[PDB]
Amino acid sequence: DKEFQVLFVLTILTLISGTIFYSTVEGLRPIDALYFSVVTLTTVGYGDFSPQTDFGKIFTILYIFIGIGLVFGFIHKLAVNVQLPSILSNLVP
Amino acid sequence: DKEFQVLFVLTILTLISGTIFYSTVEGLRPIDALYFSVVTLTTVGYGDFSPQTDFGKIFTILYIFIGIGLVFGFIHKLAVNVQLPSILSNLVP
Amino acid sequence: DKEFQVLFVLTILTLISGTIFYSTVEGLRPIDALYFSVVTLTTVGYGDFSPQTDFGKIFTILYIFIGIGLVFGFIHKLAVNVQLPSILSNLVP
Amino acid sequence: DKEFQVLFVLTILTLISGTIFYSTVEGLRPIDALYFSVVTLTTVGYGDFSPQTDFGKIFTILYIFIGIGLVFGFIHKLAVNVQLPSILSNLVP
Numbered sequence: 001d002k003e004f005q006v007l008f009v010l011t012i013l014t015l016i017s018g019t020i021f022y023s024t025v026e027g028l029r030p031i032d033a034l035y036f037s038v039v040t041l042t043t044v045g046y047g048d049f050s051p052q053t054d055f056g057k058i059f060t061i062l063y064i065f066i067g068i069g070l071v072f073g074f075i076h077k078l079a080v081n082v083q084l085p086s087i088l089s090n091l092v093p
Numbered sequence: 094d095k096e097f098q099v100l101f102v103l104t105i106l107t108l109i110s111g112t113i114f115y116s117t118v119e120g121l122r123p124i125d126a127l128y129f130s131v132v133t134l135t136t137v138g139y140g141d142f143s144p145q146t147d148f149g150k151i152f153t154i155l156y157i158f159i160g161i162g163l164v165f166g167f168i169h170k171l172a173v174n175v176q177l178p179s180i181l182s183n184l185v186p
Numbered sequence: 187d188k189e190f191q192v193l194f195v196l197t198i199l200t201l202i203s204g205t206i207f208y209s210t211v212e213g214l215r216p217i218d219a220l221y222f223s224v225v226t227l228t229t230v231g232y233g234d235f236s237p238q239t240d241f242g243k244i245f246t247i248l249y250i251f252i253g254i255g256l257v258f259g260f261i262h263k264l265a266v267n268v269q270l271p272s273i274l275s276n277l278v279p
Numbered sequence: 280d281k282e283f284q285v286l287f288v289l290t291i292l293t294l295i296s297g298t299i300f301y302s303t304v305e306g307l308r309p310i311d312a313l314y315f316s317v318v319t320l321t322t323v324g325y326g327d328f329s330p331q332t333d334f335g336k337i338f339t340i341l342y343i344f345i346g347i348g349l350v351f352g353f354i355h356k357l358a359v360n361v362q363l364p365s366i367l368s369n370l371v372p
């Protein structure tokens with residue numbers, strides 16, 4: 001709960017940074033920048049968007065290393081402290 | 094066993110939702126929608142399919158965050174409670 | 187050691203199955219089929235190769251679910267029982 | 280701390296090897312080779328770059344198996360021994 005709120009905020013800030021960076025330097029629409037940031041940090045990485053500038057490539061290297069750990073921490077916990085109980089609630093007779 | 098059955102069903106429902114969504118909004122054939130949903134939530138993300146609409150991009154953001162944890166829970170357990178014993182069975186003299 | 191040998195063999199068999207399947211049904215050269223099988227099961231998923239047939243898509247769904255757990259088990263252990271000691275050996279004075 | 284320094288160096292060496300290999304054999308600019316090496320070993324795998332030669336494909340198979348474990352060890356620890364405390368520091372009243 002308490003830890004869920006922090007990983008939420010931390011994830012949001014990371015995604016906001018990506019949205020701002022890729023819309024500015026890589027010229028993406030904000031929605032596309034957000035979508036790309038999420039697809040990147042979850043490692044889905046479709047490649048429909050990818051950085052074309054050297055600035056964008058270098059940022060992306062750093063963004064991945066800093067952001068993957070945070071994002072998957074949030075995912076794992078969104079799963080552990082928020083969805084694991086809810087599914088159990090729709091279990092017990 | 095019991096926990097395997099629940100993660101199976103949960104995964105199936107998630108994949109059904111993706112199949113329905115991407116066949117409707119993104120215009121994929123159902124088999125392609127299913128295939129895309131699986132490739133997305135396992136993070137393989139080939140990019141042969143990817144959402145082209147803003148609706149599809151937003152759903153995909155949410156779908157990834159909600160679904161990755163469930164899918165990899167199932168994978169890890171399909172591995173832990175179903176394939177780890179079976180391989181050991183074809184071991185002991 | 188003992189467990190390393192089993193995860194090695196298991197991984198090899200999985201990769202052989204993929205190599206055979208994708209070279210036959212998807213028409214890839216064997217080296218390309220092997221490379222694609224590895225890129226798939228490690229979730230790198232560049233998308234330079236991807237299944238074009240419905241048979242290939244369905245197999246790929248199943249291949250991912252069955253194979254990711256095994257492959258990452260091997261990777262994690264190749265890391266835990268084979269490279270973690272070796273790096274420590276080149277540490278202690 | 281001590282363990283953070285080792286996983287840092289190990290990661291750097293792995294990324295240097297990839298940078299050298301893909302710039303030489305696959306003809307990438309060094310910055311692109313580095314970027315590609317990172318995108319590969321974190322499994323983001325956009326596919327804007329991918330090996331076109333058989334030498335490059337075989338190396339990439341081996342590079343992934345050897346490098347993913349190391350890279351994600353570093354990521355998880357960059358998260359555990361360097362960012363987990365820092366976020367807690369900006370917490371306690």
Ligand SMILES: CCCCCC
Nearest residue numbers: 047048049050051052
């Ligand atoms: C499918 C190619 C996308 C290119 C992104 C810049």
Ligand SMILES: CCCCCC
Nearest residue numbers: 140141142143144145
């Ligand atoms: C390889 C490009 C695929 C585009 C998907 C809409």
Ligand SMILES: CCCCCC
Nearest residue numbers: 233234235236237238
């Ligand atoms: C980059 C497109 C590859 C298509 C694979 C069939």
Ligand SMILES: CCCCCC
Nearest residue numbers: 326327328329330331
């Ligand atoms: C989007 C296609 C990239 C091809 C890399 C060699």
Ligand SMILES: [Cs+]
Nearest residue numbers: 044137230323
């Ligand atoms: Cs990917």
Ligand SMILES: [Cs+]
Nearest residue numbers: 046139232325
């Ligand atoms: Cs991709």
Ligand SMILES: [Cs+]
Nearest residue numbers: 046047048140
């Ligand atoms: Cs793509």
Ligand SMILES: [Cs+]
Nearest residue numbers: 139140141233
């Ligand atoms: Cs693609």
Ligand SMILES: [Cs+]
Nearest residue numbers: 232233234326
């Ligand atoms: Cs591609």
Ligand SMILES: [Cs+]
Nearest residue numbers: 047325326327
């Ligand atoms: Cs691509």
Ligand code: NA
Nearest residue numbers: 043136229322
């Ligand atoms: Na991935």
